[PDB]
Design an enzyme around this catalytic site. Structure first.
Site, PDB file in Angstrom:
ATOM      1  CG  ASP A 349      -1.749  25.278  -2.033  1.00 22.89           C
ATOM      2  OD1 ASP A 349      -2.143  26.023  -1.033  1.00 22.89           O
ATOM      3  OD2 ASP A 349      -0.527  25.227  -2.274  1.00 22.89           O
ATOM      4  CE  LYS A 460      15.757  45.206   0.703  1.00 20.46           C
ATOM      5  NZ  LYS A 460      16.214  44.868  -0.670  1.00 20.46           N
ATOM      6  CG  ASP A 690       2.572  22.670  -2.026  1.00 20.92           C
ATOM      7  OD1 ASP A 690       1.491  23.297  -2.024  1.00 20.92           O
ATOM      8  OD2 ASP A 690       3.673  23.212  -1.798  1.00 20.92           O
TER       9      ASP A 690
HETATM   10 MG   LIG Z   1       1.453  25.021  -0.868  1.00 19.73          MG
END
Ligand SMILES: [Mg+2]
Ligand SMILES: C[C@@H]1O[C@@H](O[C@H]2C[C@@H](O)[C@]3(CO)[C@H]4[C@H](O)C[C@]5(C)[C@@H](C6=CC(=O)OC6)CC[C@]5(O)[C@@H]4CC[C@]3(O)C2)[C@H](O)[C@H](O)[C@H]1O
Ligand SMILES: *[C@@H]1O[C@H](CO)[C@@H](O[C@@H]2O[C@H](CO)[C@@H](O)[C@H](O)[C@H]2NC(C)=O)[C@H](O)[C@H]1NC(C)=O
Ligand SMILES: *[C@@H]1O[C@H](CO)[C@@H](O[C@@H]2O[C@H](CO)[C@@H](O)[C@H](O)[C@H]2NC(C)=O)[C@H](O)[C@H]1NC(C)=O
Ligand SMILES: CC(C)CCC[C@@H](C)[C@H]1CC[C@H]2[C@@H]3CC=C4C[C@@H](O)CC[C@]4(C)[C@H]3CC[C@]12C
Ligand SMILES: CC(C)CCC[C@@H](C)[C@H]1CC[C@H]2[C@@H]3CC=C4C[C@@H](O)CC[C@]4(C)[C@H]3CC[C@]12C
Ligand SMILES: *[C@@H]1O[C@H](CO)[C@@H](O)[C@H](O)[C@H]1NC(C)=O
Ligand SMILES: [Mg+2]
Ligand code: NA
EC number: 7.2.2.13
Lengths: 996, 32, 291
Positions: A349, A460, A690
């Site tokens: 990931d 911005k 995670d």
């Molecule tokens: Mg993650």
């Protein structure tokens, strides 16, 4: 009917977000500014359930204790115990004064299974207990507007269809449908893996509920700004709720170590029942009745069951898991300690796993030169040059013109891991200035801010004017930051080494290429400029109220760009390189944007520098992408939008022809589809993640790895291994240990499987040659569960013979834990010599005491008789029953000692599989103690007072201890020349036949 | 008489051997 | 996955033909060497022992005391009428005494007439082979009175009041030493204490000792024991067809249809006992003449 329930959960979610505010309020029946009456809220609260996921399925402790009492190995020992009591029942009811051998053996095997269960259960329970000490679930109350009033209630008391307000910092309670926002940015990292804080606007933007901005999600955090919204989904019906419920209701699979143990038992019982049946027929062909032959069949099969290999294998796995827990790499399942080494495809990931999931100042621009800042999590990298005037100006522009400040307890914490209040970009800037430029507290208060201008919705820009404390110039210092396209239009002067220059295109275009360099690198860049306001046109008393043009928008002095991105963790790139070195395919699977995923992939090692995607070739040749042959592209990026329209064969081809693959914008369900696609090839898969999106991916993978702190609770529970320190290098340590303990298990198994031949051959020739029993049962127990336990346990401590992180991952269909080379060694060659040595000591004991070996044939008929007290030896002497039985038992004792003597050589040769015992070396202290304790224990069992009474093991005449020495020396020399031919000739004979 | 064997001395020597080998092995696994 | 039997690219039971021959040839050579090594070492072991004496003789320190009817449980249960009930006993007695007939001991070159009176021990030199085949003292069945007879091929023994002879375990070089004249209460026994190993039978408890009424012993010259003129033994190689001394015991006054325990204990200094081996020195029997 749970199949349909799980299938409706493998599909990506649907929604009704694309609805006008009136259609939404009509469908749900809720006031857009008053919510609903509290009675209606309680009416729903007691109708469908509180806003909280259903707790996990509780696992009672007696269930997993009974689980540890079963399995595959403990089951073989169970059937062994059952066969022992069956044979004992037959021997009891059919013959006179039956013996208790089989009964004591059965209760011993049962005790072995129970004790192994107690130890393994205690270990897994310890892992789960230390895991419960990490659930620091702090209740979080949400701000809900009901009946026209604002009230803060528990998150579980929130229901469907009611106004909910969120503030920057607060957590999004349920799945909201935004109705009114004020520069609100949420954090979709734990759910959709989107790293940078995605803003939330009331207008519907994308057909995908995850990508659109009119939906806030469960467990996401409103970073900055404030917003309102109607709760569309609540409880388990939420997005992360469906993901978590899918995670719990998935299959774990069969670990590779377990499949190896299962096939191992297949071969153990295969030869066991082959010998038992062939000898059952042989015994019936000789003379023994069905009553006796049945006992022979059971005796031969039960004898071929490694009684202690269960305790040794459990301790082996436990020792390696201990080393895993030493480096904060805890494993929940015990056998999970082996799976990392056998892995051959790691699906990782990006957000939170490959990266730090934190905005960090990546690169800076100064003097038309790119300066890379240190972006490590612990600050252990190269420090840029911080002695130029351009830096002293740029650092003040960033440290002053920024709405970022530290909080209260931010004192003892490090400069990076501490919490910062405000925008993520401003947080990265504040940390970089506080780290490479002293401190921002006294640096910010040194320049008293007069009038500021926050970020604008269009064009911005963020500017502010401050007083100047320099002891040479009282002119006001004006600073401004913003997008480079907004600052280039409002700049005319350029700073360089301290002086100014015009906006000549020779260096302005050099600024443009730098902007596209830092931008194309997947980073977000900002521009910083400042100017000295003339104190003659704007004196120290004049107040520049924020209304009209009090500051020159143009003619400013540009100092430099400042890029930023979430950087990968410290040991992440090196670890990825180590895994690729070991032949492990690294495949990135993340839901983040592809423009950033590809950059991080090239930055960590998933995409090797030089390899081109299917799009890169079309861009280098200025030709359509539909023309290039995908075979000319080694790496490939696969978008989640395109992944939705894919078949099984297409995904198979994606993994087969592309070596470096990156799946971007993939949903958690698609992550699971990808993991399954990898498993279809037949390779071991490890998912490292995670967020909650990694729960269905960590669950279905052969082994899941969750981050111990930066990870979500659902993916942490659905995983099989936890990294309590979040050090991604632990994956490299794991893949090394998984191969190490695999080889050591091979050595220890060959050790326990070698002693089987001299343990059974006495009974075999006892049936054939009709000689007195050479080896006893209790002595066999003293070998399998007595002496040999310490050597076999010490065989786990052996180190690498060559570099294991160099060889390719083991093929599951080829490299079995127990192959025919181990059966050909233990059962075929070493155990055979050990059996001959035992019979040699046997014949020595009987020939020296009066029974010549030739005279021992057909002698057991009258030898075992309990009443013929006149049994002629070879010298004509008459032996009583107990006298000759004393000789038989004092003949079992040296057979046992002989086993220990030959086990010395078998342990030394099993310690090394290919190397020589001198190359490797007797550096294993546990093995040295194993031999000392083994011999001392064997001697104690023979010379302890009262052993010929309790264990029927009688003292030995010292010359017996030397009857086994030549056989041990022979074993050692034979295996040594074996490993020598394996070394010198690595072709095939000694290697493919004996090297196991 | 040849019908007697000093089993106590052999037994005693074996027990002393078993004691010394075990304490030596303990010194081996305690490298200090 | 379990039909790997064969293929068109050759494999049988798992491997090819050329592989089966290589493995089989290796195993034949390997196991052949193992066999030759075991045989060579077992030969050295045979060279470490002599032909005239066992190296270790301590495991037979207390000689045993066996009987002629090797019963399945040392029990003598039969019927005084039914001849087939006691056939298993008589068969073993006749076969045991088949080598003691006057015709069996006829050669004067291997037999020596010891004497009608028990004398001192007869030592025939050393145990080496320097001397020829030693002589074995004769022992005619007539010595066991009332338990020998001059019967035909079948020794018609005692139906009522049976006979049970005892025998001392043949041990090489063993020299029996009867107890001193200072006999520590050895029950009624004759004064021929110096040249015969005494053996006295008795019951086992207050019940057995009462049921067994009268016992009559028979031996060489009428002594209940073994004469010292027949010891020591010089092995089967040097003294083949050796006849160890015998001594019969008859139980005249028994309580018919009652199982009673008898313990025949042989006494002497060189005769040990054992609480674990009821045969070392002593001897037990369970007689029951059920009519
Ligand atoms: Mg993650
Ligand atoms: C022909 C037969 O021989 C004798 O009995 C034999 C059968 C049986 O009695 C036993 C005791 O039960 C067997 C038992 O079966 C199997 C074993 C437990 C086996 C195993 C080792 C191991 O690790 O797993 C299994 C190896 C031999 C064994 O250790 C014992 C050895 C003593 C013996 O006694 C031998 C008696 O004299 C009997 O009366 C006569 O009928
Ligand atoms: C052997 O058996 C005979 C019987 O055949 C016994 O002879 C009897 O002896 C008693 C004296 O004890 C005499 O009163 C009888 O007249 C004898 N009968 C016969 C037929 O001779 C003889 O005593 C037994 N011998 C021993 C040593 O007990
Ligand atoms: C042989 O034993 C019998 C017992 O079976 C003895 O005779 C018994 O003597 C008692 C008195 O003590 C009487 O009550 C019985 O009636 C007698 N029985 C018979 C059958 O006579 C006999 O004295 C014993 N004889 C010898 C020589 O010991
Ligand atoms: C291969 C080599 C290095 C092994 C070294 C250990 C050897 C020499 C040790 C291991 C066990 C030892 C024996 C242990 C028990 C007995 C009984 C005792 O009453 C006399 C010594 C004697 C007979 C020992 C002789 C030496 C011995 C064989
Ligand atoms: C030439 C070399 C390599 C052969 C190696 C094997 C030798 C050392 C072996 C072969 C047979 C062995 C002998 C076998 C029999 C006996 C009797 C025993 O109660 C004491 C040990 C003793 C005396 C052994 C000593 C060692 C021995 C001689
Ligand atoms: C034993 O003592 C008795 C008298 O008490 C005597 O008649 C006999 O001759 C003695 N025997 C020996 C061998 O001394
Ligand atoms: Mg075993
Ligand atoms: Na799993």
């Amino acid at each position: 009917k749970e199949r349909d329930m799980d299938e409706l959960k493998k599909e990506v979610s649907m929604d009704d977000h694309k609805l006008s505010l009136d259609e939404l309020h009509r469908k749900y029946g809720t006031d857009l500014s008053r919510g609903l009456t509290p009675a209606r809220a309680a009416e729903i609260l007691a109708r469908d359930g509180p806003n909280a996921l259903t707790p996990p399925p509780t696992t009672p402790e007696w269930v997993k204790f009974c689980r540890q009492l079963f399995g595959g190995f403990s089951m073989l020992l169970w059937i062994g115990a059952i066969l022992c009591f069956l044979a004992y029942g037959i021997q009891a009811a059919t013959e006179e004064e039956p013996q208790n051998d089989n009964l004591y053996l059965g209760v011993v095997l049962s005790a072995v299974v129970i004790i192994t269960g107690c130890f393994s259960y205690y270990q897994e329970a310890k892992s789960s207990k230390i895991m419960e000490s990490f659930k620091n679930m702090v209740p979080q109350q949400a701000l809900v507007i009901r009946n026209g009033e604002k009230m803060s209630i528990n998150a579980e008391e929130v229901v469907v269809g009611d106004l909910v307000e969120v503030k920057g910092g607060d957590r999004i309670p349920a799945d909201l449908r935004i109705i009114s926002a004020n520069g609100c940015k949420v954090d979709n990292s734990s759910l959709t893996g989107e790293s940078e804080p995605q803003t939330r606007s009331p207008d519907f933007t994308n057909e995908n509920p995850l990508e659109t901005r009119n939906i806030a999600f469960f467990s996401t955090n409103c970073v900055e700004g404030t917003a309102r919204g109607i709760v569309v989904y609540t409880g388990d019906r939420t997005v992360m709720g469906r993901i978590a419920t899918l995670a719990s209701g998935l299959e774990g699979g069969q670990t590779p170590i377990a499949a190896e143990i299962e096939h191992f038992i297949h071969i153990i019982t295969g030869v066991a029942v082959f010998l038992g049946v062939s000898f059952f027929i042989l015994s019936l062909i000789l003379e023994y009745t069905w009553l006796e032959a049945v006992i022979f069949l059971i005796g031969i099969i039960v004898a071929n069951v490694p009684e202690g290999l269960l305790a040794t294998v459990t301790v082996c796995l436990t020792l390696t898991a201990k080393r895993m827990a030493r480096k904060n790499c805890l494993v929940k399942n015990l056998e999970a300690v082996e799976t990392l080494g056998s892995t051959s495809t790691i699906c990782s990931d990006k957000t939170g796993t490959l990266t730090q999931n934190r905005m960090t100042v990546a690169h800076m621009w100064s003097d038309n030169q790119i300066h890379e800042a240190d972006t490590t999590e612990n600050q252990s990298g190269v420090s840029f040059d911080k002695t130029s005037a351009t830096w002293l100006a740029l650092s003040r522009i960033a440290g002053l013109c920024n709405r970022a400040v530290f909080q209260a307890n931010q004192e003892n914490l490090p400069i990076l891991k501490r919490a910062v209040a405000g925008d993520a970009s401003e947080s990265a800037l504040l940390k970089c200035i506080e780290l490479c430029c002293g401190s921002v507290k006294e640096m910010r208060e040194r320049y008293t801010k007069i009038v500021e201008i926050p970020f604008n919705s269009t064009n911005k820009y963020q500017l502010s004017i401050h007083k100047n404390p320099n002891t040479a110039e009282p002119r006001h210092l004006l600073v401004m930051k913003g997008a480079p396209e907004r600052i280039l239009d409002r700049c005319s002067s350029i700073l360089i080494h301290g002086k100014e220059q015009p906006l000549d295109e020779e260096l302005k275009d050099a600024f443009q290429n730098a902007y596209l360099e830092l931008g194309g690198l997947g980073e977000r860049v900002l521009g910083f400029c400042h100017l000295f306001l003339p104190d003659e046109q704007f004196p120290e008393g004049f107040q520049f109220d924020t209304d009209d043009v009090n500051f020159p928008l143009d003619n400013l002095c540009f100092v430099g760009l400042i890029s930023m991105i979430d950087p990968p963790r410290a040991a992440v790139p090196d670890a990825v390189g180590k895994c690729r070195s070991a032949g492990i395919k690294v495949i990135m699977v993340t839901g983040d944007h592809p423009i950033t995923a590809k950059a991080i992939a090239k930055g960590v090692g998933i995409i090797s520098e030089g390899n081109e995607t299917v799009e890169d070739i079309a861009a280098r040749l200025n030709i359509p992408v539909s023309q290039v042959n995908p075979r000319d592209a080694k790496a490939c990026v696969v978008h989640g939008s395109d992944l939705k329209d894919m078949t099984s064969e297409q995904l198979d081809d994606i993994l087969k022809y592309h070596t470096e693959i990156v799946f971007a914008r993939t949903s958690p369900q698609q992550k699971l589809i990808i993991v399954e696609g990898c498993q279809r090839q037949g390779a071991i898969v490890a998912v490292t993640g995670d967020g909650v999106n990694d729960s269905p991916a960590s669950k279905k993978a052969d082994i899941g790895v969750a981050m111990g702190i930066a990870g979500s609770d659902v993916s942490k529970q659905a995983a099989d291994m936890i990294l309590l320190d979040d050090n991604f290098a632990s994956i490299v340590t794991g893949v090394e240990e998984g191969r190490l303990i695999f080889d050591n298990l091979k050595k220890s198994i060959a050790y326990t499987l070698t002693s089987n031949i001299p343990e059974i051959t006495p009974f075999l020739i006892f049936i054939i040659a009709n000689i007195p029993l050479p080896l006893g049962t209790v002595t066999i127990l003293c070998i399998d569960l007595g002496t040999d336990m310490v050597p076999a346990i010490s065989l786990a401590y052996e180190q690498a013979e060559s570099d294991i992180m160099k060889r390719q991952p083991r093929n599951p269909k080829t490299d079995k834990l127990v192959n025919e080379q181990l059966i050909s060694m233990a059962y075929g060659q070493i155990g055979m010599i050990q059996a001959l040595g035992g019979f040699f000591t046997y014949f020595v004991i009987l020939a020296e005491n009066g029974f010549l070996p030739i005279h021992l044939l057909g002698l057991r008929v009258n030898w075992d008789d309990r009443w013929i007290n006149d049994v002629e030896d070879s010298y004509g002497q008459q032996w009583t029953y107990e006298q000759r039985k004393i000789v038989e038992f004092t003949c079992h004792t040296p057979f046992f000692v002989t086993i220990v003597v030959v086990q010395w050589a078998d342990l030394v040769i099993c310690k090394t599989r290919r190397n020589s015992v001198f190359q490797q070396g007797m550096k294993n202290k546990i093995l040295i103690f194993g031999l000392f304790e083994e011999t001392a224990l064997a001697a104690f069992l023979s010379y302890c007072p009262g052993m010929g009474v309790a264990l029927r093991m009688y003292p030995l005449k010292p010359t017996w201890w030397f009857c086994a020495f030549p056989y041990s020396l022979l074993i050692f020399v034979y295996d040594e020349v074996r490993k020598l031919i394996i070394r010198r000739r690595p072709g095939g004979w000694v290697e493919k036949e004996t090297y196991y | 008489d040849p019908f007697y064997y000093d089993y106590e001395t052999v037994r005693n020597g074996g027990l002393i051997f078993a004691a010394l080998a075990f304490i030596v092995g303990l010194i081996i696994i305690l490298s200090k | 996955k379990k039909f790997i039997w064969n293929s068109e690219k050759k494999e049988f039971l798992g491997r090819t033909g050329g592989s089966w021959f290589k493995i089989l040839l290796f195993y034949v050579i390997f196991y052949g060497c193992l066999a030759g090594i075991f045989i060579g070492t077992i030969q050295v072991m045979l060279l470490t022992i002599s032909e005239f004496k066992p190296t270790y003789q301590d495991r037979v320190a207390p000689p045993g005391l066996t009987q002629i009817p090797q019963s399945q449980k040392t029990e003598i249960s039969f019927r005084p009428n039914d001849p087939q009930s006691y056939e298993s006993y008589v068969v073993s007695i006749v076969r045991f005494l088949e080598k003691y007939k006057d015709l069996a001991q006829k050669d004067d070159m291997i037999f020596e007439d010891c004497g009608n009176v028990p004398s001192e021990l007869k030592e025939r030199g050393e145990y080496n082979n320097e001397r020829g085949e030693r002589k074995v003292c004769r022992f005619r069945l007539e010595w066991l009175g009332n338990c020998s007879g001059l019967n035909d091929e079948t020794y018609g023994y005692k139906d009522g009041k049976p006979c049970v002879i005892i025998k001392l375990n043949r041990v090489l070089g063993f020299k029996p030493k009867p107890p001193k004249n200072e006999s520590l209460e050895t029950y009624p026994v004759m004064k021929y204490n110096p040249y015969v190993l005494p053996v006295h039978c008795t019951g086992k408890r207050d019940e057995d000792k009462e049921k067994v009424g009268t016992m009559e012993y028979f031996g060489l010259g009428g002594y209940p024991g073994f004469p010292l003129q027949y010891y020591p033994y010089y092995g089967k190689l040097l003294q083949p067809k050796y006849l160890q001394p015998l001594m019969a015991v008859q139980f005249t006054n028994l309580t018919m249809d009652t199982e009673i325990r008898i313990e025949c204990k042989a006494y002497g200094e060189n005769i040990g006992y054992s609480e674990k081996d009821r045969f070392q020195g002593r001897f037990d029997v369970k007689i029951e003449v059920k009519s």
